[PDB]
Amino acid sequence: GSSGSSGGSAASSALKGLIQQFTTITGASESVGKHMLEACNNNLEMAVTMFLDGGGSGPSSG
């Protein structure tokens, strides 16, 4: 068990970076941050602004 594989090698490390910022800022998962950043040309600011606007409700805040 526990063994990396990786498929395609084209913009991953960087992507992660942002993803991390997203999964951290927002609190979503990577896969999500990857989908959000994937629709934001890999732009956290956008992904965030996008995800945020599109679904603004935490676990317990107000």
Domain regions of the chain by residue span: 1-62
Hey, is 41 helix, strand or coil?
A: coil
Q: Are 36 and 27 in contact (CB under 8 A)?
A: no
Structure-determination approach = NMR
* Residue 8 CB burial class (10 angstroms; 0-12, 13-18, ≥19): exposed
SS (H, E, C) the chain: CCCCCCCCCCCCHHHHHHHHHHHHHCCCCHHHHHHHHHCCCCCHHHHHHHHHHCCCCCCCCC
d(CA 27, CA 23): 4
